[PDB]
Design a protein around this ligand. Structure first.
Ligand SMILES: Nc1ncnc2c1ncn2[C@@H]1O[C@H](COP(=O)(O)CP(=O)(O)OP(=O)(O)O)[C@@H](O)[C@H]1O
Ligand SMILES: Nc1nc2nccnc2c(=O)[nH]1
Ligand SMILES: [Cl-]
Ligand SMILES: [Mg+2]
Ligand SMILES: [Mg+2]
Length: 158
């Protein structure tokens, strides 16, 4: 199965967290990375007093079940999603979301795939389009179609 994972980090300087996360994704059992999008810089959807997000997309070939993959992404968030500050550990700044899991539709207590809001988010769609321009969603919607319809602005690279 090709799973598409969105990476987001809103650390002030996120490159080292993002790289640590990418390495960890490549260590997930029964899986391997196929391709990684560019890193993109995207404003937060609120006050400008917050750090930019770094957003990227990863194609991961996996034989894991969707919930097993989620266990691993959540583990990675726990293990390398927080950065040590001067006095204490900081809060979670790394987000690993499963955008698509092959052509599967998943609606459980733990999982909603396709990701419930990705079609509203240029910061999810654009990196995905870079690595999968011909992508078709389970219901037959095309990624190209969603971007064409909504006209979301292209993202600046990090
Ligand atoms: N496709 C998916 N990928 C990752 N987590 C998912 C998911 N579908 C549902 N979830 C659930 O989402 C819950 C909350 O995860 P969080 O990472 O805190 C939300 P977030 O990513 O910060 O916001 P967002 O979902 O608006 O992007 C998890 O406990 C997980 O079970
Ligand atoms: N720019 C941006 N904003 C966000 N806001 C909430 C959750 N994820 C994100 C994300 O990944 N990028
Ligand atoms: Cl449904
Ligand atoms: Mg998210
Ligand atoms: Mg999340």
């Amino acid at each position: 199965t090709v799973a598409y994972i969105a990476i987001g980090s809103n650390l002030a300087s996120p490159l080292e967290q993002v790289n640590a996360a990418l390495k960890a994704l490549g260590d997930i059992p029964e899986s391997h990375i196929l391709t990684v999008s560019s890193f993109y810089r995207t404003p937060p959807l609120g006050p400008q007093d917050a750090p930019d997000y770094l957003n990227a997309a990863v194609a991961l070939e996996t034989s894991l079940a969707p919930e097993e993959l989620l266990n691993h992404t959540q583990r990675i968030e726990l293990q390398q999603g927080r950065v040590r500050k001067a006095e204490r550990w900081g809060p979670r700044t790394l987000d690993l979301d499963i955008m698509l899991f092959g052509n599967e539709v998943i609606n459980t207590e733990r999982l909603t795939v396709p990701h419930y809001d990705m079609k509203n988010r240029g910061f999810m769609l654009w990196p995905l389009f870079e690595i999968a321009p011909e992508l078709v969603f389970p219901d037959g919607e095309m990624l190209r179609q969603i971007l064409h319809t909504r006209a979301f602005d292209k993202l600046n690279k990090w």
